[PDB]
Each structure stands twice: as C-alpha cells, then as structure tokens.
Design a protein around this ligand. Structure first.
Ligand SMILES: [Mg+2]
Ligand SMILES: [Mg+2]
Ligand SMILES: [Mg+2]
Ligand SMILES: [Mg+2]
Ligand SMILES: [Mg+2]
Ligand SMILES: [Mg+2]
Ligand SMILES: [Mg+2]
Ligand SMILES: [Mg+2]
Ligand SMILES: [Mg+2]
Ligand SMILES: [Mg+2]
Ligand SMILES: [Mg+2]
Ligand SMILES: [Mg+2]
Ligand SMILES: [Mg+2]
Ligand SMILES: [Mg+2]
Ligand SMILES: [Mg+2]
Ligand SMILES: [Mg+2]
Lengths: 245, 208, 50, 52, 109
RNA sequence: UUACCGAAUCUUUGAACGCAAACGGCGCAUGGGAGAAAUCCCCGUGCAUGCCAUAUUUCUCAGUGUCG
RNA sequence: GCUCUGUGAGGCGAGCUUCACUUAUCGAAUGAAGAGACCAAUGGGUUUCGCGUAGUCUGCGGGCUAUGCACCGUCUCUGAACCAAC
RNA sequence: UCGGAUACUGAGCACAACGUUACACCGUUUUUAGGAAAAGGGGCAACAGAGAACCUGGGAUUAUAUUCCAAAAAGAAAUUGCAUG
RNA sequence: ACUCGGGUGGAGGCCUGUAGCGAUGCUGACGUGCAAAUCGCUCGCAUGAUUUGGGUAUCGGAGCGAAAGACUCAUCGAACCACCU
C-alpha cells in the first residue's frame, strides 16, 4: 500500500503544532515551599490570547521566593480573572476565583479548573475553555479527593494537588457555528496542519484502508480492533458501540 | 534594620542548600552507594567487614605496625652491599604468611576497591587459625606501612620487647573476630532503615 | 547582481583571465600541437555557474 | 517629558530629553507615580494599624 | 555554604601557560606595480593620485604605510578596489605637499 | 641547461583544529612591526575535541565516599 | 510465563496471594529551593565506641539473645522589598 | 557613512556532551549535568524582518560614483575610536 | 409595546471588472510549432480557504496532497543516480 495519513502525522513534520506566536506553556507556579507552607500573592498583569487556544492566558506576576527579582508566570485564566487582580497561590490561600490552593482544602462541591493530577506537575486537568471539574469528595483519612473531570468522568487525586478556583475563561466557543470553510481555516491556522479533512473513502486504496472502489464505500466494518496495527487502525477505533445514541 | 522572613516578605538571606542542591554525579552516587548498602540485607561474609576492631585496640595495633617498618629504598640498597624485622605487607605475601601460618596476627583493611580481594581473607585466617582483625581503613594500614594504602598487614614476628604487647593485642583481636567466628559467620547485616523512615515508623507506632 | 563572495569573484576572475586566445608564439615552438585554445569559454554558451 | 528619539540618536541625547525629573520619571506617568506614593503610604498605614 | 540549587565547579588554580623573516608581508609585497592606463594618468596629473595594483590581501592602511616607505610620500587617502580580474587596485591620493606627478616621474613613469 | 638529492621554501584551504563561513570574516593570549596623535594596521606563535602520561622542584581542587 | 526482584508481617495451600516496607525500578516536579527529626524507637554504635540484669557461649579477650541504663539527642479592581543592621 | 560582515533574532539547523547503533554518516539539542577563567555549554540561520553616522553640487569618465573632487578640499555634515587643551 | 421615513456608515470566503492568479469554450491557431503544452479571442477568481519573493521543514518500499494515484527538477500506480547487471 502506502503510508496512511494517520501514520504520517506521527512523523510530526508538516503536522507539528505551529506555536511561533504561542506564549509558552500555560502552567501553575512551581510548587515552591511557599505554596506548601503559605501563599504567594501574584497580581494578574494581562490576560492574553494565545493563538490556537480558546482560553485566555493570564500573566500573573509573582515575586520570586528566594531572590530579588519578580517572576512573571503564565497560566490559563479562570473566568473573571481581571488584570490587577491579586491571585493567591499556596496552601493557606483564601478560597476565591483565581486562587490556587490545595485540592483537599477546596470545599467539596466547588468547581475548580486547571487541576493538577500528579502533585506538583503544574496543572493539567480542566484547562480548555469553559472547562472545570467539580470536587465530589474528600477523604482526609487517606488524603485523596475525588473530582469530576470535565468529561463525565470521576477521578481520585491527592489533596496535596493544586487546583485553581472557577471555570476556565472563554467558555462557549463551540456554540457559535463556524459557517465558512474559511472560518475554520483560521482556527486551525494557529493550531496545526489538521485541516481540511479529506474523507478516506474519497482517498485511494493505497492511501487509506477505506479508500478505493467504484462507489466510494468502506468495504469492511469501520469499527477497527484495538490491536489493529497502525495504518489499519482507522475508522471507528475499539468502538464499543456505533450508531446514534 | 531587622527583616521579616515570613513567606512573601523580605527575600531570605541565602540559606544553605547543600541538602537539596544538585550535586555532581559522582557525589550523588557515592552518597547513594553508601545508602544502598546499609539498607540492603548484606551477607554475613561481607557484613563482617562492617564489624571491626575496636579503635582503642586498633590504634594500639597500627602503632605496632609502625614499629616494624619495611626498609626504605634508600636503606635497602645500603643493606645489600653485604633484613630488619618488619611487617609483611601485600596481598600476595600476606596470603602466604597465612597459609604457612608463619603470621601470628593479620590486619585486614575494612575498605577495599573490590572487597573480593580480601573478602575471602577472614575465612582464610579462621581456617589457619591465624589471629586476624579487620580495621577501619586501608589508608591507615597505608600510612602505618608508609604506603598510601594497604589491603593487609601481617605481624609475622616481633622483637622480645614487644612480645606481650602483641600477645594481648592478639587476644584483644581474636577476642572480637576469631573467637566470634561462629557469630561472624552468622550475622546477616544491613537492613538499616533511614532515620527518615525509622522516625516515620517511630511515629506510626506512636499513633497506634 | 552586485553580490559575490570574493571567493566567487576570484573564480570568475580566474576563468576570465583564463579565457584568452593562445599566444601566437607558442604555436611556433618545435613539436607544438596546440593551435586554438580548446578551453575558450563564452558567457552566452557554457556557464560557470558560481 | 520624553522624546521619541531613535536609539540611534538616543545615546547622544541629553538625559532629560528622555525623562522628566520626577521619580520614575522616564518610566511612569505622573498619575502612576502618585498612584504608588499613595499606595505606598496608605497600605503601610493600614499595616501599621493591624498591629493594633 | 553552597547557595545555588545546582553545583558549579570551583575555581582551581591554573598555571599561566623558522623563516629568518617571519613577516612575509612587506612594503614590497603590498604595493606591486604602478598602473599606467589613461584613467590613471588622468589621476596623477588631475587628482594628485598614484594608481597601483597592490597585493589583493593588503588593506588600505597597509597601502599608506607602504607608499610612505617605497616612494617616501604621504597618502591622504587610499581607496582600493579589487579588479574584476582579481588584482587589487589602489588609487592612492597624495598629500598636497607631495606632488603625484613629480613622484610618478621619479618612479620611472 | 639537463639529471638527481640531503638543505630549505612550501600561499588559501582540507582530517582542519581558536570561532565561523556563498564572510578571502572575526577572536583571546603572546612576541614582533609600522606608525601615530594611544586608538588603528600588518605579522609570527599558541588557542579544537577526545584520550593516555605527568604535575618529577609532585599543580589547584570537589565529595553529608572512608577514615583521622 | 520468566526475569528484572529486595525486604518484613501474615494466612492459605504442597512457594502462592494479602498486608505493610523501602534501597531496585517506574512516573513527576524542579534552576534538584527548604525532606525528616528534635515531638524520640519491636532505632543507632568509631569519641555514642559503654555499662547493669537473666539466659546461653567462649580462641579467657569477650561474645550472643532478651532487657534496662546511658550516649547519638536538640531547638520554637496592579506599591515596595536583594547587594546585613557566632 | 551605500549593502554586507564586524554585531539581532526568526521558521530553523547542528558542534559539544550524552545517548543509541555490529558501525554515527542517528537522535535529543543541552548534557544523570562540576559547561563561570576575570542557574540553564558553543555556533549558525534574514543583502526584503530588527539594526544601520552623508548630503548635495560638479565642467567628474569612453566606461564608476550618495564611492571620484583638494586647500577656498565644490563643499557642507554626521559619526566611531583614542588623545588634546 | 418598537415599528415606518431619511440619512450615516462601509460589512461581506458579496457583485462587475483591471493587475495578478487561473483556464471554460472555440473541441479556434499551431500541431516535425514561437513552444517537448505555446498563441488568439472568449471565459473563471480577483478582500481572500487570495496571489507572491526570500528563507525553512517534509521525499523514494518515502514524502506531500481541499484526494486527481495528483505532485516530488520535461521523470511517478513508486524520482533520479550508480551499481548488482
Ligand atoms: Mg478517487
Ligand atoms: Mg490497503
Ligand atoms: Mg458517498
Ligand atoms: Mg460511502
Ligand atoms: Mg540561454
Ligand atoms: Mg553567481
Ligand atoms: Mg570598497
Ligand atoms: Mg577553522
Ligand atoms: Mg530558534
Ligand atoms: Mg546572524
Ligand atoms: Mg533589513
Ligand atoms: Mg550600512
Ligand atoms: Mg552606467
Ligand atoms: Mg469577491
Ligand atoms: Mg461572473
Ligand atoms: Mg482512480
């Protein structure tokens, strides 16, 4: 045959993220001693658009814990995070929007964003716009809170894990129809060479497992096995069910 | 002009970070190599080098070795125009003195690059019933012999003035090793907890 | 255009002064073989692409 | 108080051509300085009161 | 007494560490031969300016110092060019105190 | 002039190695030169990495490695 | 499956799993930037190396098991900040 | 004094180290890493990006000029280095 | 209740149409040509998913593709070079 496009994206050549104009990683502050035994006040300096990203990123400027210099630092913004706002990261941070305080100290039922799964990893869950995760339980005896991932998905993480308070900003992007082929041209301009998506049945038999034939049709089930070798694992992958739900 | 050093106030004056610094790899590894072999369960054959001659006894013995120096190159040449009693030194010479049992005390060093060089030696003195002692450093057997390191030393013989000074040492020495040879061939060593984990266990049992 | 590394200018300079008719007097030597220069170059024909 | 000198000529300009003779003179608007002079004073005055 | 998160290697002491005419460059290697074209003859009389093919690796300041030594005369300026052919060509203009004409004829030109 | 071979000469490069390089570019250090009201300018030599040896008057060090 | 793969406590069955452990290993974070302790032991043993108790052992020097002394071990709704005043 | 380099960074690249490979002609691009020689090694990569001190007149050519001109520099500048009162 | 005039404003993968980018038709010219794909008129897009220079990245059992097995130096249902041969 010939290499499938799903496999070629793994070369990550043409298919790499753009990101020249990206501001850098949008993370939480390094889990300092100050985070673990107090709090760091950083004022939000400016809320930026990172191209290719939905959520605005904030520019909180924490003062450096150990030296005379000030440490501007960039994290995806919770909604209502205005410039000049004083963020408070740390274990005994007050419970407010934008504050980053230990997950086990956040009240059960309150919704948090930019949650970190592993302790100290600097915020990986609930980072996309509009996204958040409600804390659904604490377990102080074993120090592991549960939380509901932005997908209907429960997950247990240590309470020492940081989280930010509130919904991530920029929510509701997806609600607006794109309408133009050109409009989606630009949302992916800042993302990657993801787009346009040619259908595999429109492709040739060399190009794709679905490709080829006179009427353009898949010839075999589109629901591929989990163990299917790459270049084969196209169509619906390890699908448990198909059909509209 | 006092300074607050609460979090988020005055910047701290530069406190020592040796404990959390990132060291050169050879430093981290000689530290960990030492940690690693306390907390593993060492074999009785190899643990015995961890057990060692009491220093007040050691210091006495190395002063004895120093009393019977090998002749210096300057003098050995000068003697040969025609040897003085001295401690046998060297793994090969000391190994003979054990087997020939001419040795009447032997001083295995505690530390050795491959302990294998000497790891067998305590069993070999125990077999020839030669008194032997392990001692803290090949560097001290070193200077005692004027070498910068000595894997071993053998007091094969001594002048009459130091006969008893050797004998009490031979029985203050095989009192700890050769007499305990039944004990030594038994004690599995190691398995020490970190005192960061001994105390953690001191407190978990404190809470229960 | 203007741009040339001097190394390229030295080479076109090389080929330029190399682009000359054989001396008349060389043909008059005994046992001479040469007549025309067999390595005459013309910019409109062979290209010294440097 | 500051001129839009190109840095090509900024080196040769007089120092006060690129500033006003006020604290933060080449850096902050006068209101921005006064925002601080207040904010320095008033914030310390509350902290001095939080000891009581 | 370390106060950096990472170790850095210490300053250690460091100990400080055939041609009879080594300088092959020379006034006589720099300047080569005066040029005798009629653009150059326009300059000797009209511009007080000697023209020379001069060593292509030589620079201007060296060409001044070479005229000073070879022909004993100051060069108020020396703007060289390297010829399409690859020779370098200096137009050296003499100081008014030095005639470019009295000197060029003294030079056998 | 020819032939041969000892003494040399052997430009820019090139493993190319002071750093680069579609740049006849640019260094630091060392000595020289010219020169000049020093700055500039030319020149020579050293200056890559790795590794082995050595510190021969035994270089300076680093390790909560081992001890003392 | 074996191996990597150690260590304790179990139970079951004729080396298998639970449970803790932690030095392998793995993941993460970090500019390896503050871990634990001092709050004290089914802890340690070279300046702490040592004593005392009962049991056993002895190359007569002490050992070892239990055990308790000591000692290791002990202190408390955007401002500015550095370059120290044993 | 123009452009370029000296002297920017960029998509990028790759020396070093390290790692992998029967093998470096691979990969990361910092290195389990002691990279300061008087916190994150070195370099390169734009003649359209950033940077960038000069202008005119000429009766100055066969052919170059924002480059040539001569002491009344046709002239007028700006600019860099050092030094000088 | 927020509608009906009138102006304003200048929106839009809006329209006509240059340049530019194409390339429908004449199945026109040419068709051993100007041309190993061109010429003419006609026509399509021409504020955009536009066109375009430079740089840079991705290629051969591979690359790249708004997908025609298209394109990857006049070479592609597997380039070209050498070799086995
Ligand atoms: Mg098709
Ligand atoms: Mg197929
Ligand atoms: Mg269909
Ligand atoms: Mg179909
Ligand atoms: Mg042609
Ligand atoms: Mg060219
Ligand atoms: Mg020039
Ligand atoms: Mg070089
Ligand atoms: Mg870059
Ligand atoms: Mg550059
Ligand atoms: Mg430019
Ligand atoms: Mg310029
Ligand atoms: Mg012309
Ligand atoms: Mg339109
Ligand atoms: Mg139309
Ligand atoms: Mg087809």
């Amino acid at each position: 045959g010939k290499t499938v496009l799903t496999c070629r994206k793994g070369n990550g050549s043409i298919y790499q993220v753009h990101g020249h104009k990206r501001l850098g990683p949008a993370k939480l502050r390094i889990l300092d001693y100050a985070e673990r035994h107090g709090f760091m006040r950083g004022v939000v300096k400016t809320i930026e658009h990172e191209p290719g990203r939905g959520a605005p990123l904030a520019r909180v400027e924490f003062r450096h814990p150990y030296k005379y210099r000030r440490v501007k630092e960039l994290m995806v913004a919770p909604e209502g995070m205005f410039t000049g706002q004083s963020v408070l990261c740390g274990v005994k941070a007050p419970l407010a929007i934008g504050n980053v305080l230990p997950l086990g100290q956040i009240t059960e039922g309150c919704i948090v964003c930019n949650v970190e799964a592993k302790v100290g990893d600097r915020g990986t869950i609930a980072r996309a716009s509009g996204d958040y995760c409600i804390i659904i339980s604490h377990n102080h005896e074993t120090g592991r809170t549960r939380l509901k991932l932005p997908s209907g998905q429960k997950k247990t993480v240590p309470s020492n894990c940081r989280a930010m308070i509130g919904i991530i900003a920029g929510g509701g992007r997806i609600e607006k129809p794109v309408l133009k082929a050109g409009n989606s041209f630009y949302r992916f301009r800042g993302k990657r060479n993801c787009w346009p998506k040619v259908r595999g049945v429109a492709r040739n038999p060399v190009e794709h497992p679905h490709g080829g034939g006179n009427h353009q049709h898949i010839g075999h089930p589109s629901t591929v096995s989990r163990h299917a070798p790459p270049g084969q694992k196209v169509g619906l992958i390890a699908a448990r069910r198909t059909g509209r739900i | 002009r006092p300074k607050n050093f609460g979090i988020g106030h005055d910047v701290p004056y530069a406190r020592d970070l040796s404990r959390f610094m990132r060291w050169p790899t050879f430093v981290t590894m000689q530290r960990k190599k030492r940690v690693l072999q306390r907390r593993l369960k060492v074999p009785p054959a190899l643990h015995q080098f961890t057990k060692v001659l009491d220093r007040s006894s050691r210091n006495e013995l190395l002063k004895l070795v120093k009393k019977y120096p090998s002749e210096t190159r300057r003098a050995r040449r000068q003697r040969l125009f025609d040897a003085p009693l001295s401690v046998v030194t060297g793994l090969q010479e000391v190994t003979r003195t054990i087997e020939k049992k001419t040795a009447r005390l032997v001083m295995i060093a505690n530390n050795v690059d491959p302990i294998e060089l000497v790891l067998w030696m305590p069993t070999l003195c125990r077999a020839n019933k030669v008194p032997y002692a392990i001692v803290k450093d090949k560097a001290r057997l070193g200077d005692a012999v004027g070498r910068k390191t000595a894997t071993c030393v053998a007091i094969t013989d001594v002048n009459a003035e130091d006969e008893a000074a050797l004998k009490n040492l031979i029985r203050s020495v095989n009192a700890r090793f050769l007499a305990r040879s039944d004990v030594i061939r038994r004690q599995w060593g190691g398995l020490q907890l970190s005192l960061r984990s001994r105390a953690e266990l001191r407190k978990k049992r404190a809470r229960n | 255009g203007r741009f040339k590394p001097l190394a390229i200018k030295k080479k076109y300079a090389k080929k330029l002064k190399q682009n000359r008719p054989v001396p008349y007097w060389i043909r008059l030597r005994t046992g001479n073989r040469i007549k025309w220069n067999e390595k005459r170059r013309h910019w409109r024909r062979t290209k010294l692409h440097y | 108080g500051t001129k839009a000198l190109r840095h090509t000529e900024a080196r040769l300009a007089s120092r006060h051509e690129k500033s006003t003779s006020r604290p933060y003179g080449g850096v902050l608007s006068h209101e921005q300085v006064r925002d601080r002079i207040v904010r320095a004073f008033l914030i310390e005055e509350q902290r001095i009161v939080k000891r009581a | 007494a370390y106060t950096r998160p990472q170790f850095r290697r210490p300053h250690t002491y460091r100990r400080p560490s055939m041609s009879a005419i080594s300088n092959k460059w020379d006034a006589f290697r720099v300047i080569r031969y005066p040029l005798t074209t009629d653009k150059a003859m326009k300059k000797i009389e009209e511009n007080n300016t000697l023209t020379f093919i001069v060593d292509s690796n030589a620079n201007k300041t060296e060409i001044k110092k070479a005229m000073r030594k070879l022909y004993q005369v100051k060069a108020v300026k020396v703007n060289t060019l390297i010829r399409p052919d690859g020779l370098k060509k200096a137009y050296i203009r003499l100081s008014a105190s030095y005639d470019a004409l009295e000197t060029a004829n003294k030079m056998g030109l």
